[PDB]
């Protein structure tokens, strides 16, 4: 075990304002009948106008635009939770539940030409046209092993820290047991997710004559991954991040630049 | 878990809107007027009842009894908050630290720029500008805890111990913050001290020296820095409740600030504080783990017991005359007879007044020497004078003998000395030192009972130790047997030297086995006309006796003269007397007047002390 | 009582040749604070304090010094910027914060964090010929002129990072990089050992990405001017690095001056490239002058169209150098103004721009006038039906395999959207 | 100022950051003096202070109407010392405000009194040439009663305290400027202290070449250091608090200036400094010590007599006071009165008072090295041998506290070692060092041992020696020499049973060995007569005390004697004692008496010599030594005990 967190103020506001936000009974109900298409759908994401947020709550409006990670967390948690309380069965078949956004972005609604480096941690919307499109591989978040001498089955779970500083242990995956008897990986068992990246370029109509283009990097991880193709114009909300290197005892100030999608839509 | 800007609102509610009537019967807001004072700098400690606070709040003072040291500084920082608010006036600079705190707070106003957000490390720490210390004071519905049973379960609590001190260091100054100044800058740098060891600065993290990227190296002195009051103290469990074959548990008590200089060793106390760890680091810990001490952080320190530091009823007993009868049947209401015995020991715990007549000091100590048969309850006595005397030090045989009596060497611990630990006569140095089997004592320890008493003083010329200590102690010796066994050495040194002998008699002893019956049969002696004082109404008497130095009248001199004479012709006709008779009369007739508290003494105290000193001389024969 | 560790406080500095960098640092917010421009007749103003605020409070965090107010306030001043720009501009770029937050004090919530404040600087000295950089003038400040051939995409350089030790897990935070291409050693050893005495690995620190204060940099190919550049001879290059608010100031082709800092690549000290202690150089940009409505210009306009004969003057006033053809003269201005475009609600649209034919024999002055009306039309493109010297004349799309970027080659066309 | 080196002062520690803030007037940070405000002050002070209370007898060379301190400016002219001993008493009284600043901020606002003393001497002289600009001693401030009391509010103030020294190690040298020289070009420097550290130059200044400077160890200069043990004696002394063991430091001046055994005031600065978990690691302790950094030590006391630095120093009586004790002398019962002046409170043990009065004034020091004879005791010892509450104890602890360099034993608390030296661990260097014993503490002094009966022989034995040759030869297992013990023993005995039985001989209830007694030139028998007249004026004496010749005549009258007096015997006298001795030892030769050997002859030239020195005859006469032979002789009771009884 190690240092866990008993009380944390500013979560427990999040979550309770989200969770607020997300019922919707002495309100019209537009999120309460949402979360029940996505039950009825077999889904796992929803979609939150931003507009509707702000117009009931200014502060984790404001807050979710510009500190997203930690603030879509709060929300994830909170959507969970209350697709619990609608139904628990339905929402202990999926681990977690995802927040997309839609509507209107005031400054966060840039190109792939403005997506600077004033946006990041902040949500933004890039509207844009799809140019590279690579394959959909598996990456796995919960691997399960057998060991045929003891016949012991272990679990290695693997956090998702495609933004977040990563070590060594987190991403060992192990082959051997404690006293080095040959482990196998039952893929039936273990849990993959589908991961892509894409690259959105400046709309050619709306990028300046003169000039080259300019293109972001974006992450779609499952639910998200076939939803666009090369060519395709697609407004693309989500996280501009920085991507960690690798190890290493000398760095330039250089850091790589990505757009973790939180949804993506067609044109 | 807890608003801790809740508990500070809480707790300001409190000290400010609490009120008692204390101050004869008016209403008094009790801490308010506390805040004034240390907010003036006329108090430093203040003591926060954790029954006041109970009064009205009672989960507060549960959340305190289990999170001292957290709500220990709510309240401290509190106390600071609302002490501008109750500032009436310029306090007169006594103190250097308080120079330094008044030009700390004028330059950072002169310097405030108010708007403006410094770093949450440029600003002064809020130890470096206190000037006071909250303490608290244990809730009575919270049982006293053994100090064997106060374990790991409850660290950071609050608990309260009562034990015998043992050991206590002196009063030494330990750095609560150390202040170092740069060399290129001329800003400050504070370190607020925690750990028991901190390893001083090198480099200013000043702005100025920041900026300039240059040298900064910082000096510390203790000029600016904050020190305390710093005592350490070793508290030892008492013998009733030690378990049935054990020896008392120790505990190191850390004393700070004003509650220093309280206690001293020999003392019966109650102590209330903080049990909290310290950090074992620097050792090769054979088990793995962050292995830690124990201490208790003294918050209330109060002499109980045996030394606890008026009304018309008690003017009334002391204006009775037979109050000196009725002191003496009190004292050991349980032993049957020797009531000239016990006025002697009366005499003994009063004392008579000191002289200092042109370079040589006349000590009013009166020495006594209770010989007899066996079984004549001479070690009920010693005790009950041990239990009832302030400080009282009842010494055996031997188990106490040499270094336990006389003060030898010890190493220290904070700071690694050779300390001098005093014996049973230091620990006794200004009460009562009940020797018993004075006669089979060593003969280094009788010379140096005689060296005190002759003195009351010990020199001592040995290899670890040269020097010459204090014991201004009242010997009341109890040895057994010139009859068969009455050294002159006892007779010219004691100033009242008793024979108890036990011939046998039906009457009186039939009188003293009903008595001993009675006892054993209701746990108290039998009724009397009399009911016999309270132990803390005797203490209270004598000690109010004491300071109540009555004078000779050059009247009597005549008196006391003839009866000098007379006692030394009949001593010359018969088959022992000098000066130190004559001395011992003088004492004992200052030590009546000073029972009758009053500030002449007369011929009645003149005959009393004679009477006595008859009664023991002709028990001798 | 050794469990915990408070940090270690400090005061002001009360109390107390070379000048240290703090006085000059208080010098630099003094001229922001205290330089006056105008006239008692015309009043003053403290353009830079003012600038500052407006500039705070519309977002931008930066602002231009001009190295003459600069150097007629405080000479020495400019002197040490020039001859030490780094630490200087550092300075500069600290006080201008100051005064930034001083100025615009009470924020309301949500702004509350003081922001970085750019300083870039211009002078009216005239620029160095690119072929003057010699090795004298290395780690100075020099303003040279150039056309800009090429501008990398705006990437993330990080000015603070936070490095967590991957055994306690403890953190460095706010390491200050240094500006421009350089690169920073990471620590090998744990400092923060005396918290356990089982002891943390060698270079045990890991970056962590989203504790990093990242800005805006672009790299810049600045070649000589064409003119500049002798007979015989090849076009000198230099290598520009632009920082949070030069980054797409410029675009590849504009004619520039650059003022900045002459500085080497410095990353660590270590068949072709038989040379010894060479380094690549470059120039460390802090300010780019590009090189080629009022209220009073709006009454002005007004009233001119108000005039009865605005037809006639404008059109008697465009090509006034060309003898007659007042009938096509009025047929350009009725072009330059174009008509009215719209939108039905079904979604088409009608075209408001006038086309125009020139037919004639080739004596006439029909490229003078093209030539006039592409000079005057506020966006015009004069070319030729076969396009132009290595410039076209409608669009092309073309995928690069490599990039699978779709370059979109401009024509005159699509070079001249919304004008002429 | 006149070109004069200004030397630094290693007991003000090291110099502080110094730094003035204005209150809106420019004080000292932290504090509340100004530099001019108090040098104007301190000028001021000097310039026009007079004492009104001040008596010619306790100024010496003094004016009491000229200014009190200019002329000791003027002293200090004529002498090369440039040291200005100055009152904080006085200072208390002229300006008290300065007195508090003085004492409150010592370090900050000594200096400021050093410039004004500099300035006002060398405006006085402009010729006058001094090894370095005198220097300021404040002395005398408030007695702290209890180190003990003291507080960490006190820290760094100028306290003053008493007590006897116990130790002086050895001159600690001290860095003050390090010298430093290049190991390629050999380029010189010097880097003066600066608060508490040197700053190595770590470049050359003529070749540049980096970290080639090296510090030349015996080239550099240094200044004189020594930790100095002293134990105090607290006037305020509280139940169960036992005796305090001090650190005092002294500097340059003040080094082996207080020998072992002395009993000083001592006024300095109360410094707190830390404590070092290791002396090889720099983490220090959260709680610091304290130690004494000395700016002025005091000889002087009221209730003692002088000592020997006092005695030896030249200028202690004024040419009133010399002539006053010469009429004094002159007056033909002045033996007397000293006997009775002594233990004023002590009834007619006239006797003992005047062979204890012998004693304090002492024989003749004589230089027999050229006759290889050895060293001579020029010491009286006295034995008191009496019934307990005889008074014995009492006189003893009289003189204990009277004299000067005193030691006080009793009984069984004592032992060899302890007496003589013995080896212990010094915690504060870490090194083993030698400690002395009473025995030598007492070296030019006196050793009252009490219960000089129950005295083990293991420790008796000591005593031969030291009575003996004035010698105590230790051969240890490391250290071998032989210590100065040149004291004089006050003894107190009890008879055997603790009561002299009226049937044994003088010797048989003494019960000391012939060896030892033969030592002491003196032994009284204080025996109770039963006597109506004594008893009754005793009781009148002893009451009289329960409720109701000067102190410093006496003093001054020893002092002048110790200094100028050195009897040396005439002829007469010579057969006299020649005489004297023969009868002695024909007495003496009963059975069970005190039998007589030569040491009885040499007792009697020390008794005579010390009479004589008590007349200031400066000639021992027969007076001298027939006055011997009646004290020896009264002393056991010779005339009323027959030659073969008690
Ligand atoms: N006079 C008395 N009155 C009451 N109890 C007595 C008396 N004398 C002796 N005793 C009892 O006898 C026992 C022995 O007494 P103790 O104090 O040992 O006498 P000693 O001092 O002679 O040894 C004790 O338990 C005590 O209670
Ligand atoms: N009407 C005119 N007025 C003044 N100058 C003229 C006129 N026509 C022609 N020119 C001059 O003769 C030159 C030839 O005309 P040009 O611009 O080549 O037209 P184009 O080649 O399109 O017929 C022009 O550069 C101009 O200077
Ligand atoms: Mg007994
Ligand atoms: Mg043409
Ligand atoms: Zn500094
Ligand atoms: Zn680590
Ligand atoms: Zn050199």
Not at chain 2, 16 to 25: K, N
Not at chain 3, 378 to 393: D, E, F, H, R
Not at chain 4, 141 to 165: F, H, Y
Not at chain 4, 621 to 641: F, G, N, P
Request: charged letters at 25%.
């Amino acid at each position: 075990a190690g240092t866990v967190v008993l009380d944390d103020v500013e979560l427990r506001e999040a979550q309770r304002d989200y969770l607020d936000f997300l019922d919707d009974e002495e309100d019209q109900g537009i999120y309460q009948s949402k979360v029940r298409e996505l039950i009825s759908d077999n889904q796992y994401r929803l979609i939150v106008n931003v507009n509707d947020l702000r117009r009931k709550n200014e502060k984790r409006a404001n807050r979710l635009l510009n500190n997203a990670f930690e603030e879509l967390v709060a929300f994830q948690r909170a959507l969970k939770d209350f697709v619990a309380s609608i139904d628990a069965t339905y929402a202990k078949q999926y681990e977690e539940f995802y927040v997309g956004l839609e509507g209107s972005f005031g400054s966060k609604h840039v190109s792939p030409r403005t997506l600077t480096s004033c946006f990041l941690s902040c949500v933004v919307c890039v509207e844009g046209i799809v140019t590279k499109c690579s394959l959909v591989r598996p990456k796995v978040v919960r691997s399960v092993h057998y060991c045929p001498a003891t016949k012991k089955t272990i679990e290695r779970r693997y956090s998702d820290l495609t933004t977040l500083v990563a070590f060594p242990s987190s991403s060992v995956y192990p082959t051997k047991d404690e006293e080095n008897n040959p482990l196998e990986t039952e893929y039936g068992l273990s849990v993959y997710k589908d991961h892509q990246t894409i690259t959105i370029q400046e709309m050619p109509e709306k990028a300046p004559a003169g000039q080259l283009p300019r293109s972001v990097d974006v992450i779609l991880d499952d639910d998200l991954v076939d939803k666009a193709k090369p060519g395709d114009r697609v407004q693309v909300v989500g996280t501009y991040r920085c991507l960690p290197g690798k190890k290493g005892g000398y760095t330039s100030g250089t850091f790589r630049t990505v757009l973790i999608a939180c949804n993506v839509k067609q044109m | 878990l807890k608003d801790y800007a809740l508990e500070k609102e809480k707790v300001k509610k409190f000290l400010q809107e609490f009120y008692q009537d204390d101050e004869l019967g008016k209403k008094q807001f009790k801490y308010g007027n506390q805040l004034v004072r240390l907010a003036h700098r006329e108090q430093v400690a203040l003591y926060v009842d954790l029954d006041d606070v109970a009064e009205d709040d009672p989960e507060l003072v549960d959340s305190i009894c289990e999170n001292a040291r957290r709500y220990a500084k709510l309240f401290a920082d509190a106390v600071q908050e609302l002490l501008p608010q109750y500032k009436e006036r310029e306090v007169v600079n006594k103190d250097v630290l308080d120079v330094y705190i008044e030009h700390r707070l004028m330059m950072e106003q002169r310097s405030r720029d108010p708007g403006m957000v410094r770093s949450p490390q440029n600003q002064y720490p809020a130890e470096l500008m206190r000037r006071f210390e909250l303490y608290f004071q244990g809730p009575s519905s919270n049982k006293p805890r053994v100090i064997r049973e106060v374990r790991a379960d409850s660290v950071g609590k609050l608990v309260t111990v009562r034990g015998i001190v043992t050991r206590v260091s002196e009063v030494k100054p330990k750095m609560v913050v150390a202040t170092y100044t740069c060399d290129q800058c001329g800003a400050e740098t504070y370190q607020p001290i925690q750990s028991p060891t901190f390893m001083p600065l090198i480099m200013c993290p000043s702005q100025e020296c920041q900026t300039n990227r240059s040298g900064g190296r910082l000096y510390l002195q203790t000029r600016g820095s904050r020190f305390i009051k710093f005592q350490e103290m070793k508290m030892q469990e008492h013998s009733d409740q030690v378990p049935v074959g054990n020896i008392p548990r120790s505990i190191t008590v850390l004393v700070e600030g004003e509650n220093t200089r309280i206690a001293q060793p020999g003392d019966h106390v109650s102590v209330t504080g903080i049990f909290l760890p310290i950090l074992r680091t620097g050792f090769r810990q054979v088990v793995q783990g962050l292995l830690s001490e124990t201490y208790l952080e003294a918050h209330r320190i109060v002499k109980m017991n045996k030394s606890e530091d008026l009304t018309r009823e008690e003017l009334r007993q002391i204006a009775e005359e037979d109050f000196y009868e009725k002191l003496a049947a009190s004292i050991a209401p349980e032993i049957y007879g020797h009531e000239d015995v016990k006025k002697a020991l009366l005499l003994l715990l009063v004392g008579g007044v000191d002289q200092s007549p042109r370079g040589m000091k006349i000590r009013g100590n009166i020495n006594i020497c209770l010989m007899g048969d066996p079984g004549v309850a001479k070690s009920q006595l010693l005790s009950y004078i041990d239990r009832l005397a302030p400080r009282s030090q009842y010494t055996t045989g031997r188990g106490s003998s040499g270094v336990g009596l006389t003060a030898a060497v010890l190493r220290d611990s904070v700071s690694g000395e050779l300390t001098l630990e005093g014996g049973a006569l230091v620990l006794a140095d200004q009460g009562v030192c009940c020797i018993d089997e004075f006669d089979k004592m060593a003969e280094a320890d009788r010379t140096a009972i005689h060296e005190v008493m002759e003195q009351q003083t010990i020199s001592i010329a040995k290899a670890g130790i040269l020097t010459t200590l204090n014991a201004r102690c009242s010997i009341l010796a109890a040895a057994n047997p010139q009859n068969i066994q009455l050294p002159a050495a006892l007779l010219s040194r004691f100033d009242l030297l008793w024979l108890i002998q036990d011939r046998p008699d039906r009457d009186n002893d039939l009188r003293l086995a009903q008595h001993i019956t009675y006892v054993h049969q209701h746990s108290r002696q039998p009724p009397s006309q009399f009911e016999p004082l309270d132990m803390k109404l005797m203490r209270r008497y004598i000690a109010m006796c004491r300071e109540k130095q009555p004078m000779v009248p050059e009247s009597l001199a005549d008196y006391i003269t003839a009866a000098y004479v007379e006692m030394r012709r009949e001593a010359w006709a018969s088959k022992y007397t000098s000066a130190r008779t004559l001395l011992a009369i003088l004492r004992l007739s200052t030590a009546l007047a000073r029972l009758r508290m009053v500030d002449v003494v007369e011929k009645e105290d003149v005959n009393e002390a004679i009477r006595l000193m008859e009664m023991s001389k002709d028990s001798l024969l | 009582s050794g469990f915990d560790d408070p940090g270690i406080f400090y005061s002001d500095s009360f109390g107390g040749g070379q000048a240290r960098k703090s006085q000059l640092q208080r010098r630099f917010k003094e001229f922001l604070r205290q330089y006056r421009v105008g006239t008692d007749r015309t009043g003053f103003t403290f353009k830079y304090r003012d600038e500052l605020k407006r500039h705070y409070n519309l977002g931008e965090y930066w602002i231009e010094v001009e190295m003459e107010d600069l150097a007629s306030f405080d000479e020495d001043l400019a002197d040490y910027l020039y001859k030490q720009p780094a630490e200087h501009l550092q300075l500069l770029e600290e006080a201008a914060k100051e005064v930034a937050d001083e100025v615009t004090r009470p924020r309301p919530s949500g702004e509350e964090v003081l922001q970085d404040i750019q300083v870039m600087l211009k002078s009216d000295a005239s620029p160095s010929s690119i072929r003057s950089l010699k090795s004298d003038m290395m780690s100075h400040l020099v303003k040279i002129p150039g056309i800009i051939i090429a501008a990398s995409a705006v990437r993330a350089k990080a000015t603070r990072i936070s490095i967590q030790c991957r055994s306690c897990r403890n953190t460095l935070t706010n390491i200050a990089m240094r500006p421009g291409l350089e690169g920073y050693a990471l620590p090998r050893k744990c400092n923060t050992d005396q918290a356990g005495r089982p002891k943390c690995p060698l270079d045990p620190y890991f970056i962590m990405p989203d504790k990093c204060k990242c800005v805006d940099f672009q790299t810049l190919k600045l070649q000589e001017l064409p003119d500049a550049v002798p007979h015989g001879e090849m076009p000198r290059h230099m290598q520009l690095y632009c920082d949070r608010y030069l980054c797409d100031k410029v675009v590849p082709g504009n004619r520039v001056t650059i003022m900045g800092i002459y500085s080497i690549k410095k990353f660590g000290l270590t068949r072709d490239r038989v040379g010894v202690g060479i380094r690549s150089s470059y120039i460390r940009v802090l300010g780019i002058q590009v090189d080629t409505v009022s209220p009073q210009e709006e009454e002005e306009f007004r009233r001119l169209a108000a005039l009865p004969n605005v037809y006639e003057v404008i059109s008697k006033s465009i090509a006034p150098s060309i003898f007659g053809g007042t009938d096509m003269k009025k047929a350009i201005a009725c072009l330059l103004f174009g008509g009215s475009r719209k939108r039905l609600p079904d979604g088409l649209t009608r075209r408001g721009d006038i086309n125009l034919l020139m037919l004639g024999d080739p004596g006439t002055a029909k490229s003078q006038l093209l030539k006039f009306v592409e000079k005057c039309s506020p966006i015009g493109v004069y070319t030729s039906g076969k396009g132009s010297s290595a410039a076209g004349l409608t669009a092309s799309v073309m995928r690069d395999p490599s990039s699978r970027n779709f370059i979109m080659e401009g024509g005159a066309m699509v070079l001249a959207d919304g004008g002429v | 100022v006149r070109g004069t080196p200004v030397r630094q002062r290693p007991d003000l520690g090291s110099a502080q950051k110094g730094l003035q803030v204005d209150l809106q007037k420019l004080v000292i940070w932290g504090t509340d003096v100004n530099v001019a405000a108090c040098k104007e002050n301190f000028q001021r002070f000097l310039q026009r202070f007079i004492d009104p209370l001040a008596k010619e007898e306790e100024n010496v060379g003094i004016d009491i109407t000229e200014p009190l301190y200019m002329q000791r400016l003027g002293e200090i002219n004529v002498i090369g010392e440039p040291f200005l001993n100055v009152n904080c008493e006085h200072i208390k009284s002229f300006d008290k405000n300065l007195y508090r600043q003085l004492i409150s901020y010592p370090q900050e606002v000594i200096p400021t009194f050093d410039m004004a003393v500099n300035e006002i001497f060398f405006d006085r002289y402009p010729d006058s040439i001094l090894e370095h600009q005198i220097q300021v001693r404040p002395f005398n401030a408030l007695k702290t009663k209890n180190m003990r009391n003291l507080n960490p509010e006190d820290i760094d103030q100028l306290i003053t305290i008493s007590g006897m020294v116990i130790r002086t190690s050895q001159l600690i040298p001290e860095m003050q400027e390090a010298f430093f020289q290049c190991q390629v070009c050999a380029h010189t420097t010097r880097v003066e202290m600066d608060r508490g550290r040197i700053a190595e130059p770590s470049v050359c200044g003529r070749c540049h070449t980096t970290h080639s400077m090296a510090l030349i160890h015996n080239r550099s200069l240094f200044s004189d250091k020594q930790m100095i043990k002293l134990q105090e004696s607290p006037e305020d002394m509280p139940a169960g608090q036992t005796p305090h063991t001090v650190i005092l430091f002294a500097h340059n001046d003040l080094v082996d200036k207080v020998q072992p055994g002395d009993r000083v005031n001592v006024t300095g600065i109360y410094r707190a400094v830390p404590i070092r978990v290791n002396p090889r690691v720099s983490n220090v302790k959260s709680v610091y010590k304290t130690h004494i950094d000395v700016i002025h030590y005091r000889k002087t006391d009221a209730k003692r007599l002088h000592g020997l630095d006092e005695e030896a120093e030249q200028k202690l009586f004024s040419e009133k006071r010399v002539e006053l004790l010469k009429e004094l002398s002159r007056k033909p019962d002045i033996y007397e009165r000293l006997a009775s002046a002594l233990a004023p409170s002590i009834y007619e043990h006239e006797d003992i008072k005047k062979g204890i009065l012998l004693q304090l004034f002492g024989g003749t020091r004589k230089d027999f090295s050229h006759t290889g004879r050895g060293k001579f005791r020029a010491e009286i010892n006295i034995l008191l041998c009496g019934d307990p509450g005889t008074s014995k104890s009492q006189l003893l602890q009289y003189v204990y506290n009277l004299v000067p360099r005193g030691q006080y034993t009793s009984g069984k608390g004592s032992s060899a070692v302890g007496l003589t030296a013995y080896v212990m661990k010094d915690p504060e260097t870490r090194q083993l060092v030698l400690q002395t014993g009473a025995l030598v503490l007492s070296d030019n002094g006196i050793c009252c041992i009490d219960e000089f009966d129950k005295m083990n022989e293991s420790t008796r034995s000591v005593l031969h020696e030291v009575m003996e040759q004035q010698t105590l030869s230790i051969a240890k297992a490391g250290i071998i020499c032989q210590l100065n013990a040149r004291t004089s023993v006050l003894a107190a005995a009890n008879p055997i049973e603790s009561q002299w039985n009226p049937k044994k001989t003088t010797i048989e209830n003494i019960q000391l060995p012939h060896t030892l007694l033969s030592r002491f030139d003196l032994i009284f028998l204080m025996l109770d007569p039963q006597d109506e007249a004594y008893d009754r004026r005793l009781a009148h004496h002893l009451v009289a005390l329960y409720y109701q010749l000067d102190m410093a005549v006496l003093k001054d009258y020893i002092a002048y004697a110790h200094s100028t007096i050195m009897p040396r015997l005439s002829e007469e006298a010579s057969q006299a004692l020649i005489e004297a001795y023969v009868d002695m030892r024909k007495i003496g030769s009963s059975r069970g008496m005190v039998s007589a050997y030569p040491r009885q002859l040499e007792s009697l030239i020390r008794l005579a010599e010390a009479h004589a020195k008590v007349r200031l005859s400066n000639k021992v006469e027969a007076i001298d030594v027939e006055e011997a032979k009646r004290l020896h002789r009264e002393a056991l009771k010779q005339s009323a005990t027959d030659p073969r009884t008690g």
